[PDB]
PDB file of C-alpha atoms and ligand atoms in Angstrom:
ATOM      1  CA  UNK A   1     -36.216 -39.598   5.608  1.00 23.27           C
ATOM      2  CA  UNK A   2     -33.809 -39.707   8.518  1.00 21.29           C
ATOM      3  CA  UNK A   3     -34.806 -36.255   9.821  1.00 21.00           C
ATOM      4  CA  UNK A   4     -38.379 -37.447  10.281  1.00 21.29           C
ATOM      5  CA  UNK A   5     -37.338 -40.649  11.972  1.00 22.81           C
ATOM      6  CA  UNK A   6     -35.304 -38.451  14.349  1.00 22.15           C
ATOM      7  CA  UNK A   7     -38.386 -36.366  15.170  1.00 24.48           C
ATOM      8  CA  UNK A   8     -40.498 -39.529  15.613  1.00 23.92           C
ATOM      9  CA  UNK A   9     -38.202 -41.056  18.209  1.00 23.23           C
ATOM     10  CA  UNK A  10     -38.032 -37.753  20.178  1.00 25.66           C
ATOM     11  CA  UNK A  11     -41.890 -37.838  20.009  1.00 24.47           C
ATOM     12  CA  UNK A  12     -41.877 -41.069  21.992  1.00 21.89           C
ATOM     13  CA  UNK A  13     -38.610 -40.487  23.963  1.00 23.24           C
ATOM     14  CA  UNK A  14     -38.541 -36.638  24.566  1.00 20.79           C
ATOM     15  CA  UNK A  15     -35.190 -36.820  26.522  1.00 20.82           C
ATOM     16  CA  UNK A  16     -33.166 -38.421  23.707  1.00 20.47           C
ATOM     17  CA  UNK A  17     -30.999 -37.138  20.921  1.00 20.85           C
ATOM     18  CA  UNK A  18     -31.871 -40.136  18.678  1.00 20.30           C
ATOM     19  CA  UNK A  19     -29.081 -39.683  16.131  1.00 17.45           C
ATOM     20  CA  UNK A  20     -26.633 -39.848  19.020  1.00 16.27           C
ATOM     21  CA  UNK A  21     -28.322 -42.344  21.349  1.00 16.37           C
ATOM     22  CA  UNK A  22     -29.569 -44.869  18.768  1.00 15.28           C
ATOM     23  CA  UNK A  23     -26.870 -44.593  16.168  1.00 18.35           C
ATOM     24  CA  UNK A  24     -24.100 -47.184  16.250  1.00 18.39           C
ATOM     25  CA  UNK A  25     -25.706 -49.458  18.825  1.00 16.93           C
ATOM     26  CA  UNK A  26     -25.545 -53.227  18.719  1.00 13.80           C
ATOM     27  CA  UNK A  27     -25.250 -55.151  15.453  1.00 15.48           C
ATOM     28  CA  UNK A  28     -28.214 -53.322  13.608  1.00 14.70           C
ATOM     29  CA  UNK A  29     -28.832 -49.798  14.883  1.00 13.09           C
ATOM     30  CA  UNK A  30     -26.972 -47.802  12.388  1.00 13.99           C
ATOM     31  CA  UNK A  31     -26.112 -48.134   8.749  1.00 12.82           C
ATOM     32  CA  UNK A  32     -25.825 -51.802   8.063  1.00 13.54           C
ATOM     33  CA  UNK A  33     -26.472 -54.707  10.320  1.00 14.48           C
ATOM     34  CA  UNK A  34     -25.536 -58.405  10.345  1.00 14.70           C
ATOM     35  CA  UNK A  35     -25.499 -61.365  12.722  1.00 15.37           C
ATOM     36  CA  UNK A  36     -27.669 -61.929  15.811  1.00 13.74           C
ATOM     37  CA  UNK A  37     -29.270 -58.868  17.628  1.00 17.69           C
ATOM     38  CA  UNK A  38     -27.486 -58.322  20.930  1.00 13.85           C
ATOM     39  CA  UNK A  39     -30.657 -57.284  22.813  1.00 14.88           C
ATOM     40  CA  UNK A  40     -34.242 -56.103  22.300  1.00 15.13           C
ATOM     41  CA  UNK A  41     -33.272 -52.579  21.102  1.00 11.73           C
ATOM     42  CA  UNK A  42     -31.018 -54.115  18.551  1.00 13.69           C
ATOM     43  CA  UNK A  43     -33.919 -56.379  17.557  1.00 12.93           C
ATOM     44  CA  UNK A  44     -36.035 -53.201  16.999  1.00 12.69           C
ATOM     45  CA  UNK A  45     -33.307 -52.030  14.706  1.00 12.39           C
ATOM     46  CA  UNK A  46     -33.199 -55.362  12.860  1.00  9.80           C
ATOM     47  CA  UNK A  47     -36.994 -55.185  12.232  1.00 13.52           C
ATOM     48  CA  UNK A  48     -36.623 -51.624  11.028  1.00  9.79           C
ATOM     49  CA  UNK A  49     -33.757 -52.603   8.640  1.00 13.22           C
ATOM     50  CA  UNK A  50     -35.962 -55.422   7.285  1.00 12.92           C
ATOM     51  CA  UNK A  51     -38.886 -52.959   6.864  1.00  9.56           C
ATOM     52  CA  UNK A  52     -36.573 -50.646   4.865  1.00 11.13           C
ATOM     53  CA  UNK A  53     -35.459 -53.614   2.726  1.00 12.68           C
ATOM     54  CA  UNK A  54     -39.140 -54.518   2.054  1.00 11.20           C
ATOM     55  CA  UNK A  55     -39.885 -50.827   1.145  1.00 11.31           C
ATOM     56  CA  UNK A  56     -37.106 -50.765  -1.435  1.00 10.84           C
ATOM     57  CA  UNK A  57     -38.628 -53.768  -3.092  1.00 10.07           C
ATOM     58  CA  UNK A  58     -41.976 -52.025  -3.720  1.00 10.27           C
ATOM     59  CA  UNK A  59     -42.690 -50.689  -7.203  1.00 12.40           C
ATOM     60  CA  UNK A  60     -43.715 -47.325  -5.718  1.00  9.31           C
ATOM     61  CA  UNK A  61     -40.287 -46.930  -4.077  1.00 11.23           C
ATOM     62  CA  UNK A  62     -38.414 -48.260  -7.128  1.00  9.07           C
ATOM     63  CA  UNK A  63     -39.742 -45.334  -9.173  1.00 11.74           C
ATOM     64  CA  UNK A  64     -38.187 -42.762  -6.843  1.00 11.02           C
ATOM     65  CA  UNK A  65     -34.671 -41.480  -6.948  1.00 12.62           C
ATOM     66  CA  UNK A  66     -34.872 -41.025  -3.157  1.00 15.22           C
ATOM     67  CA  UNK A  67     -34.006 -43.912  -0.871  1.00 15.77           C
ATOM     68  CA  UNK A  68     -35.682 -44.393   2.649  1.00 18.18           C
ATOM     69  CA  UNK A  69     -32.977 -42.189   4.241  1.00 20.86           C
ATOM     70  CA  UNK A  70     -33.661 -39.161   1.990  1.00 19.90           C
ATOM     71  CA  UNK A  71     -37.332 -39.733   1.037  1.00 17.23           C
ATOM     72  CA  UNK A  72     -39.194 -37.052   3.005  1.00 16.48           C
ATOM     73  CA  UNK A  73     -42.753 -38.019   4.059  1.00 19.11           C
ATOM     74  CA  UNK A  74     -45.223 -36.303   6.350  1.00 17.64           C
ATOM     75  CA  UNK A  75     -46.270 -37.125   9.857  1.00 15.28           C
ATOM     76  CA  UNK A  76     -47.222 -35.364  13.072  1.00 12.14           C
ATOM     77  CA  UNK A  77     -46.194 -35.779  16.692  1.00 10.34           C
ATOM     78  CA  UNK A  78     -49.054 -34.640  18.965  1.00 12.37           C
ATOM     79  CA  UNK A  79     -49.253 -35.599  22.687  1.00 10.53           C
ATOM     80  CA  UNK A  80     -46.322 -37.921  22.158  1.00 12.77           C
ATOM     81  CA  UNK A  81     -48.065 -39.972  19.497  1.00 11.48           C
ATOM     82  CA  UNK A  82     -47.134 -40.404  15.888  1.00 13.65           C
ATOM     83  CA  UNK A  83     -49.522 -40.264  12.994  1.00 13.33           C
ATOM     84  CA  UNK A  84     -48.387 -40.862   9.438  1.00 13.52           C
ATOM     85  CA  UNK A  85     -50.243 -38.579   6.986  1.00 16.10           C
ATOM     86  CA  UNK A  86     -52.886 -39.641   4.415  1.00 20.62           C
ATOM     87  CA  UNK A  87     -51.097 -37.215   2.039  1.00 18.57           C
ATOM     88  CA  UNK A  88     -48.180 -39.637   1.754  1.00 17.09           C
ATOM     89  CA  UNK A  89     -47.835 -41.582  -1.542  1.00 13.99           C
ATOM     90  CA  UNK A  90     -47.507 -45.392  -1.230  1.00 10.68           C
ATOM     91  CA  UNK A  91     -43.692 -45.516  -0.865  1.00  8.56           C
ATOM     92  CA  UNK A  92     -43.447 -42.651   1.615  1.00  8.22           C
ATOM     93  CA  UNK A  93     -46.396 -44.067   3.573  1.00  6.48           C
ATOM     94  CA  UNK A  94     -44.682 -47.498   3.907  1.00  2.59           C
ATOM     95  CA  UNK A  95     -41.506 -45.800   5.105  1.00  2.00           C
ATOM     96  CA  UNK A  96     -43.468 -43.693   7.581  1.00  2.00           C
ATOM     97  CA  UNK A  97     -44.983 -46.865   9.031  1.00  2.00           C
ATOM     98  CA  UNK A  98     -41.517 -48.520   9.337  1.00  2.00           C
ATOM     99  CA  UNK A  99     -40.204 -45.486  11.219  1.00  2.00           C
ATOM    100  CA  UNK A 100     -43.223 -45.159  13.438  1.00  2.00           C
ATOM    101  CA  UNK A 101     -42.972 -48.818  14.431  1.00  2.00           C
ATOM    102  CA  UNK A 102     -39.271 -48.428  15.155  1.00  2.00           C
ATOM    103  CA  UNK A 103     -39.810 -45.317  17.320  1.00  2.00           C
ATOM    104  CA  UNK A 104     -42.430 -47.125  19.379  1.00  2.00           C
ATOM    105  CA  UNK A 105     -40.256 -50.288  19.708  1.00  2.00           C
ATOM    106  CA  UNK A 106     -37.349 -48.035  20.874  1.00  2.00           C
ATOM    107  CA  UNK A 107     -39.451 -46.478  23.667  1.00  2.00           C
ATOM    108  CA  UNK A 108     -40.645 -49.831  24.999  1.00  3.16           C
ATOM    109  CA  UNK A 109     -37.310 -51.756  25.374  1.00  8.19           C
ATOM    110  CA  UNK A 110     -34.287 -51.287  27.750  1.00  6.86           C
ATOM    111  CA  UNK A 111     -31.366 -49.186  26.611  1.00 10.87           C
ATOM    112  CA  UNK A 112     -28.077 -51.056  27.376  1.00  7.73           C
ATOM    113  CA  UNK A 113     -25.316 -48.398  27.163  1.00  5.27           C
ATOM    114  CA  UNK A 114     -22.681 -51.169  27.065  1.00  6.06           C
ATOM    115  CA  UNK A 115     -23.929 -52.013  23.558  1.00  7.43           C
ATOM    116  CA  UNK A 116     -23.118 -48.495  22.464  1.00  9.94           C
ATOM    117  CA  UNK A 117     -20.415 -48.460  19.768  1.00  6.81           C
ATOM    118  CA  UNK A 118     -20.316 -52.219  19.848  1.00  9.03           C
ATOM    119  CA  UNK A 119     -17.288 -53.714  18.341  1.00  5.35           C
ATOM    120  CA  UNK A 120     -18.574 -55.435  15.266  1.00  8.43           C
ATOM    121  CA  UNK A 121     -16.526 -58.554  16.007  1.00 12.23           C
ATOM    122  CA  UNK A 122     -19.717 -59.507  17.902  1.00 17.01           C
ATOM    123  CA  UNK A 123     -22.043 -59.606  14.914  1.00 18.85           C
TER     124      UNK A 123
ATOM    125  CA  UNK B   1     -45.640 -23.430   3.005  1.00 17.87           C
ATOM    126  CA  UNK B   2     -48.181 -23.381   0.210  1.00 17.61           C
ATOM    127  CA  UNK B   3     -47.779 -27.097  -0.585  1.00 16.66           C
ATOM    128  CA  UNK B   4     -48.868 -27.982   2.941  1.00 20.50           C
ATOM    129  CA  UNK B   5     -51.807 -25.625   2.872  1.00 18.57           C
ATOM    130  CA  UNK B   6     -52.825 -27.370  -0.374  1.00 22.36           C
ATOM    131  CA  UNK B   7     -52.703 -30.773   1.336  1.00 18.57           C
ATOM    132  CA  UNK B   8     -54.633 -29.410   4.348  1.00 19.37           C
ATOM    133  CA  UNK B   9     -57.555 -28.162   2.288  1.00 19.24           C
ATOM    134  CA  UNK B  10     -57.769 -31.484   0.356  1.00 20.27           C
ATOM    135  CA  UNK B  11     -57.800 -33.132   3.850  1.00 19.34           C
ATOM    136  CA  UNK B  12     -61.049 -31.341   4.633  1.00 18.62           C
ATOM    137  CA  UNK B  13     -62.407 -31.073   1.030  1.00 18.14           C
ATOM    138  CA  UNK B  14     -61.162 -34.337  -0.696  1.00 16.87           C
ATOM    139  CA  UNK B  15     -62.857 -33.418  -4.068  1.00 17.10           C
ATOM    140  CA  UNK B  16     -61.026 -30.101  -4.548  1.00 20.35           C
ATOM    141  CA  UNK B  17     -57.885 -29.020  -6.300  1.00 22.59           C
ATOM    142  CA  UNK B  18     -57.313 -26.156  -3.800  1.00 22.44           C
ATOM    143  CA  UNK B  19     -54.745 -24.222  -5.835  1.00 20.69           C
ATOM    144  CA  UNK B  20     -57.291 -24.101  -8.639  1.00 21.81           C
ATOM    145  CA  UNK B  21     -60.570 -23.817  -6.722  1.00 20.17           C
ATOM    146  CA  UNK B  22     -59.494 -21.368  -3.994  1.00 17.59           C
ATOM    147  CA  UNK B  23     -56.962 -19.315  -5.866  1.00 17.22           C
ATOM    148  CA  UNK B  24     -58.129 -16.010  -7.318  1.00 12.84           C
ATOM    149  CA  UNK B  25     -61.521 -15.962  -5.621  1.00 11.03           C
ATOM    150  CA  UNK B  26     -63.161 -12.851  -4.250  1.00 11.95           C
ATOM    151  CA  UNK B  27     -61.143  -9.898  -2.961  1.00 13.60           C
ATOM    152  CA  UNK B  28     -58.772 -11.990  -0.608  1.00 12.09           C
ATOM    153  CA  UNK B  29     -58.298 -15.579  -1.761  1.00 10.36           C
ATOM    154  CA  UNK B  30     -55.097 -15.321  -3.593  1.00 11.54           C
ATOM    155  CA  UNK B  31     -51.994 -13.224  -3.342  1.00 13.36           C
ATOM    156  CA  UNK B  32     -53.069  -9.907  -1.982  1.00 10.91           C
ATOM    157  CA  UNK B  33     -56.433  -8.788  -0.809  1.00  8.56           C
ATOM    158  CA  UNK B  34     -58.129  -5.428  -0.186  1.00  7.84           C
ATOM    159  CA  UNK B  35     -61.601  -3.998   0.374  1.00  8.35           C
ATOM    160  CA  UNK B  36     -64.679  -5.771   1.771  1.00  4.30           C
ATOM    161  CA  UNK B  37     -64.935  -9.659   1.542  1.00  5.49           C
ATOM    162  CA  UNK B  38     -67.543 -10.572  -1.056  1.00  2.44           C
ATOM    163  CA  UNK B  39     -68.850 -13.603   0.890  1.00  2.00           C
ATOM    164  CA  UNK B  40     -67.981 -15.994   3.725  1.00  2.00           C
ATOM    165  CA  UNK B  41     -65.257 -17.873   1.765  1.00  2.00           C
ATOM    166  CA  UNK B  42     -63.623 -14.606   0.992  1.00  2.00           C
ATOM    167  CA  UNK B  43     -63.893 -13.755   4.697  1.00  2.11           C
ATOM    168  CA  UNK B  44     -62.009 -17.035   5.453  1.00  4.20           C
ATOM    169  CA  UNK B  45     -59.337 -15.801   3.129  1.00  3.41           C
ATOM    170  CA  UNK B  46     -59.235 -12.377   4.796  1.00  5.09           C
ATOM    171  CA  UNK B  47     -58.736 -14.021   8.242  1.00  4.60           C
ATOM    172  CA  UNK B  48     -56.011 -16.203   6.799  1.00  2.00           C
ATOM    173  CA  UNK B  49     -54.241 -13.160   5.224  1.00  2.00           C
ATOM    174  CA  UNK B  50     -54.422 -11.404   8.619  1.00  2.00           C
ATOM    175  CA  UNK B  51     -53.020 -14.544  10.340  1.00  2.00           C
ATOM    176  CA  UNK B  52     -50.095 -14.525   7.862  1.00  2.00           C
ATOM    177  CA  UNK B  53     -49.529 -10.808   8.565  1.00  2.00           C
ATOM    178  CA  UNK B  54     -49.485 -11.524  12.346  1.00  2.23           C
ATOM    179  CA  UNK B  55     -47.004 -14.442  11.770  1.00  2.00           C
ATOM    180  CA  UNK B  56     -44.586 -12.190   9.908  1.00  2.83           C
ATOM    181  CA  UNK B  57     -44.560  -9.853  12.844  1.00  4.54           C
ATOM    182  CA  UNK B  58     -43.322 -12.535  15.275  1.00  2.69           C
ATOM    183  CA  UNK B  59     -39.644 -12.552  16.225  1.00  2.41           C
ATOM    184  CA  UNK B  60     -39.445 -16.284  15.446  1.00  4.05           C
ATOM    185  CA  UNK B  61     -40.591 -15.663  11.854  1.00  2.00           C
ATOM    186  CA  UNK B  62     -38.433 -12.537  11.458  1.00  2.00           C
ATOM    187  CA  UNK B  63     -35.318 -14.668  11.975  1.00  2.00           C
ATOM    188  CA  UNK B  64     -36.138 -16.913   9.018  1.00  2.00           C
ATOM    189  CA  UNK B  65     -35.324 -16.266   5.421  1.00  2.00           C
ATOM    190  CA  UNK B  66     -38.482 -18.217   4.501  1.00  3.72           C
ATOM    191  CA  UNK B  67     -41.808 -16.426   4.319  1.00  2.00           C
ATOM    192  CA  UNK B  68     -45.212 -18.206   5.142  1.00  2.97           C
ATOM    193  CA  UNK B  69     -45.505 -19.337   1.488  1.00  5.46           C
ATOM    194  CA  UNK B  70     -42.138 -21.170   1.445  1.00  3.58           C
ATOM    195  CA  UNK B  71     -41.693 -22.034   5.156  1.00  3.73           C
ATOM    196  CA  UNK B  72     -42.267 -25.801   5.270  1.00  2.00           C
ATOM    197  CA  UNK B  73     -43.779 -27.091   8.551  1.00  2.00           C
ATOM    198  CA  UNK B  74     -45.108 -30.499   9.508  1.00  2.88           C
ATOM    199  CA  UNK B  75     -48.634 -31.713   9.910  1.00  3.93           C
ATOM    200  CA  UNK B  76     -50.706 -34.820   9.280  1.00  8.94           C
ATOM    201  CA  UNK B  77     -54.068 -35.445   7.656  1.00  5.96           C
ATOM    202  CA  UNK B  78     -55.661 -38.567   9.191  1.00  5.02           C
ATOM    203  CA  UNK B  79     -59.410 -39.366   8.844  1.00  9.14           C
ATOM    204  CA  UNK B  80     -59.906 -35.959   7.290  1.00  8.21           C
ATOM    205  CA  UNK B  81     -58.558 -34.084  10.289  1.00  8.19           C
ATOM    206  CA  UNK B  82     -55.525 -31.888  10.509  1.00 12.83           C
ATOM    207  CA  UNK B  83     -52.983 -31.959  13.271  1.00 10.39           C
ATOM    208  CA  UNK B  84     -50.066 -29.557  13.363  1.00 12.22           C
ATOM    209  CA  UNK B  85     -46.907 -31.260  14.701  1.00 12.67           C
ATOM    210  CA  UNK B  86     -45.216 -30.621  18.086  1.00 11.27           C
ATOM    211  CA  UNK B  87     -41.924 -30.785  16.119  1.00 11.79           C
ATOM    212  CA  UNK B  88     -42.682 -27.401  14.558  1.00 12.31           C
ATOM    213  CA  UNK B  89     -40.647 -24.396  15.818  1.00 15.85           C
ATOM    214  CA  UNK B  90     -42.670 -21.341  16.957  1.00 17.16           C
ATOM    215  CA  UNK B  91     -42.910 -19.625  13.535  1.00 18.53           C
ATOM    216  CA  UNK B  92     -43.777 -22.768  11.587  1.00 18.55           C
ATOM    217  CA  UNK B  93     -46.274 -23.777  14.285  1.00 18.45           C
ATOM    218  CA  UNK B  94     -48.091 -20.391  14.038  1.00 17.17           C
ATOM    219  CA  UNK B  95     -48.252 -20.747  10.264  1.00 18.33           C
ATOM    220  CA  UNK B  96     -49.546 -24.303  10.571  1.00 16.47           C
ATOM    221  CA  UNK B  97     -52.351 -23.055  12.814  1.00 14.14           C
ATOM    222  CA  UNK B  98     -53.260 -20.261  10.321  1.00 11.40           C
ATOM    223  CA  UNK B  99     -53.479 -22.808   7.504  1.00 13.17           C
ATOM    224  CA  UNK B 100     -55.404 -25.338   9.513  1.00 13.99           C
ATOM    225  CA  UNK B 101     -57.965 -22.706  10.494  1.00 11.32           C
ATOM    226  CA  UNK B 102     -58.291 -21.593   6.885  1.00 12.35           C
ATOM    227  CA  UNK B 103     -58.793 -25.168   5.609  1.00 12.71           C
ATOM    228  CA  UNK B 104     -61.549 -25.754   8.146  1.00 15.91           C
ATOM    229  CA  UNK B 105     -63.221 -22.368   7.388  1.00 18.27           C
ATOM    230  CA  UNK B 106     -63.107 -23.276   3.640  1.00 17.98           C
ATOM    231  CA  UNK B 107     -64.941 -26.585   4.212  1.00 18.49           C
ATOM    232  CA  UNK B 108     -67.714 -24.998   6.270  1.00 18.44           C
ATOM    233  CA  UNK B 109     -68.812 -22.077   3.984  1.00 16.96           C
ATOM    234  CA  UNK B 110     -70.590 -21.992   0.544  1.00 21.54           C
ATOM    235  CA  UNK B 111     -68.503 -21.864  -2.598  1.00 21.06           C
ATOM    236  CA  UNK B 112     -69.924 -19.161  -4.961  1.00 23.74           C
ATOM    237  CA  UNK B 113     -68.407 -19.914  -8.406  1.00 25.72           C
ATOM    238  CA  UNK B 114     -69.502 -16.458  -9.624  1.00 23.98           C
ATOM    239  CA  UNK B 115     -66.830 -14.979  -7.334  1.00 24.86           C
ATOM    240  CA  UNK B 116     -64.206 -16.967  -9.177  1.00 24.14           C
ATOM    241  CA  UNK B 117     -61.701 -14.684 -10.932  1.00 26.42           C
ATOM    242  CA  UNK B 118     -63.504 -11.683  -9.556  1.00 26.09           C
ATOM    243  CA  UNK B 119     -62.747  -8.503 -11.285  1.00 25.94           C
ATOM    244  CA  UNK B 120     -60.863  -6.516  -8.721  1.00 23.92           C
ATOM    245  CA  UNK B 121     -62.885  -3.385  -9.484  1.00 21.27           C
ATOM    246  CA  UNK B 122     -65.122  -4.849  -6.740  1.00 19.36           C
ATOM    247  CA  UNK B 123     -62.605  -4.665  -3.914  1.00 21.75           C
TER     248      UNK B 123
HETATM  249 CA1   CA C   1     -29.133 -50.948  10.560  1.00 21.30          CA
HETATM  250 CA1   CA C   2     -55.009 -13.098   0.007  1.00 22.52          CA
END
């Protein structure tokens, strides 16, 4: 769920408020996404959106009322690394992996502030 | 919270249903506890009860409506080891440590089935 993804990104980027910094960035970072990623961060968000789309196709996820934004799963941050828990059921474990991969991708690419609150004419 | 402690013990003892196996055992394992531990497992439960008592004394815990049984915290099981998350606030982190120590103590001591549903005359 979104709260865990928030905690994951802070795990890798301790100076960020993820819901502020990485919301509404580029064509993909944020609810929705369309068109060509504007940079590498946006491309991280595109992969993550595609991972969420693949999760919602799985039979395990289809059974659950919860969607990837509200489906709580368990993970730990320890020494700035993320580990998804073996206690997670198949759906929540796939989502945890999506989010972990996105948090790592976020920490390894440039942040271009001029893509912040990008006017969606560009997408 | 109790759900996480359940998952923790299964992390170390994958064949157990912890809420069945380690509830109502000896003088301490279970809600309450008094008197002298009947064996080492019961002693694990006494330490854990004392750790919960110490947690409820902390200013961080005193602020929270939640008690150690309902206070959800985050942790992961991975390769049968437990890691409490850096995302945990001070109260939830102390509780996570109590529970982790108890799960480990449980996996390292004998289980004496004859102490199961011990008649509390003995305590
Ligand atoms: Ca998106
Ligand atoms: Ca007890």
